[PDB]
Amino acid sequence: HLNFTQIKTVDELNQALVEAKGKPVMLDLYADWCVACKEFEKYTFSDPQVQKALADTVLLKANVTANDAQDVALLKHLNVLGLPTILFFDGQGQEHPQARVTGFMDAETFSAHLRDRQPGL
């Protein structure tokens, strides 16, 4: 498995970003009831090459299973309309919406995505 850092609230994301100054960041939105999210963990985040490509990236994950106030506020703040969703941030903590992943991608597809669209790297 890849080593993610759990963040819960909008401001935990913001702090995490401020701390990752100078480094590329990726945020995975996850939920227990999300099937394709599970596919990502089992088939994509598990790929040896995908992992090496993410070796020097700050990895963040928000677990939104409960769908509580904080989860909803976060999803709303990120303008996330569904799962799975992966966000990407540059060294200046700025997100690149044009780099979002909103469906499942297998290892190969995701590898090409990181190669062609990942910010800050």
Domains of the chain: 1-121 (3.40.30.10)
Place of tokens 């939104």: 64
Provide φ and ψ at 95, rounded to 5°.
Answer: -75, 150
Helices (H) and strands (E) in the chain, counts: 5, 4
Place of tokens 């997100």: 95
Q: State the structure-solving technique.
A: X-ray
- Resolution in Å, one decimal, please: 2.5
How do 25-30 and 85-89 pair as beta strands? antiparallel
Beta-strand ranges (E) seen in the chain are 5-6, 25-30, 58-63, 85-89
Q: How far apart are CA 44 and CA 23, in angstroms?
A: 22
Selection from 24, 45, 1 nearest residue 118 by Cα: 24
Q: Starting from the edge strand earliest in sequence, which strands make up the sheet with 5-6, in order? A: 5-6, 58-63, 25-30, 85-89
Q: How far apart are CA 107 and CA 121, in angstroms?
A: 19
